[PDB]
Every structure is written in C-alpha cells, then in structure tokens.
Amino acid sequence: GNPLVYLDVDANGKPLGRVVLELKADVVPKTAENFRALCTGEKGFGYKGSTFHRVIPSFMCQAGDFTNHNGTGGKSIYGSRFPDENFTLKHVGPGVLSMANAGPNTNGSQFFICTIKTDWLDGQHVVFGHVIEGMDVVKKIESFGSKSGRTSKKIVITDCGQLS
Numbered sequence: 232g233n234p235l236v237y238l239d240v241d242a243n244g245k246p247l248g249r250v251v252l253e254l255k256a257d258v259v260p261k262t263a264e265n266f267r268a269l270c271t272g273e274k275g276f277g278y279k280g281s282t283f284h285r286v287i288p289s290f291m292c293q294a295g296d297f298t299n300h301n302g303t304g305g306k307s308i309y310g311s312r313f314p315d316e317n318f319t320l321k322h323v324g325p326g327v328l329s330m331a332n333a334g335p336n337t338n339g340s341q342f343f344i345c346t347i348k349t350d351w352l353d354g355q356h357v358v359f360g361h362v363i364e365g366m367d368v369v370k371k372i373e374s375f376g377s378k379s380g381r382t383s384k385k386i387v388i389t390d391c392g393q394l395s
C-alpha cells in the first residue's frame with residue numbers, strides 16, 4: 232500500500248510532536264519514493280536533523296534543504312534534481328504535501344505542508360501526499376513563522392522514518 236511516514240519535530244530542542252503523512256505512490260511513485268527514502272535515510276542522507284527554514288502563516292511550512300539549511304539546496308535520491316512526474320493531485324486544502332521547486336523540472340528534496348488551500352500552485356508543484364495525523368503539530372510549527380517566512384524558533388526534524 233501507499234507508504235505511511237512520520238516527522239518528529241522540535242522547536243529550540245523541545246518536542247512538538249509527530250506529523251504522519253500518506254505518500255500517494257499509486258499516483259506519483261517516483262516522487263513518493265524519493266520522500267520515503269529521505270525519511271528513512273537509507274541512501275545515507277535525508278531529512279533527519281534538518282529544519283523548517285521558511286514558515287508563512289496562512290500559507291505553508293517549508294523544509295527539506297538538508298545541505299544549505301536556507302532554501303537554496305537539497306538533493307534527490309536520483310541525483311541533484313528530477314523531472315515533474317505529473318500534476319494529477321491538486322492543492323485542495325490544508326494538509327497537502329507538495330514539492331518545492333525553482334521552476335519546471337527542478338525537484339530535489341525540499342517540500343512544503345499547506346496550511347490553507349493553495350490552488351494557485353496547481354500545475355506548477357507536484358503534490359504527492361497529505362497529513363494523516365498531527366495537523367495540530369503542523370499548526371504549532373505555523374505559529375513560529377511570520378509573513379516573511381523567518382521562524383522565531385529553530386524548527387528541526389529531530390527524527391523521521393516509515394510506519395508501514
């Protein structure tokens with residue numbers, strides 16, 4: 232079945248709880264597999280220890296730059312970047328999980344979790360999952376963001392992995 236994965240998130244070293252995500256491998260298998268493997272670390276690199284570097288309330292929480300920690304970096308399990316798989320899934324509401332990019336065919340490791348319907352991103356960012364449990368933890372993360380995206384506490388993925 233579709234992978235079920237988790238992110239355990241801290242703020243300034245204090246646990247906020249766990250976000251559980253379903254990865255829709257039945258629709259975007261290549262994109263789902265990249266995220267799954269970056270959660271387990273099985274390729275020797277991944278999300279463990281990296282940050283939510285940009286968090287904008289009433290928009291989205293962005294993470295996954297485990298190379299430069301500022302939105303300029305990241306890499307996929309396939310190479311530096313990989314193509315846009317498809318745009319079949321849409322940004323339907325809060326809790327959508329989607330890939331960040333710098334234009335067409337620039338997916339790496341950066342991703343975002345929506346806190347509102349971001350339908351204006353449809354057809355430009357590859358959606359690949361959604362929050363199963365822990366939207367309250369996502370709201371905690373959101374509360375440490377700002378309109379510029381700068382966070383008022385250091386938000387870290389303390390641990391991550393796969394549940395099924």
Ligand SMILES: CCn1nnc(NC(=O)c2cccs2)n1
Pocket residue numbers: 291293330331332333334343356
């Ligand atoms: C919706 C969150 N998000 N997803 N992808 C992005 N990328 C950017 O904003 C930029 C990339 C390069 C210069 S700006 N943001």
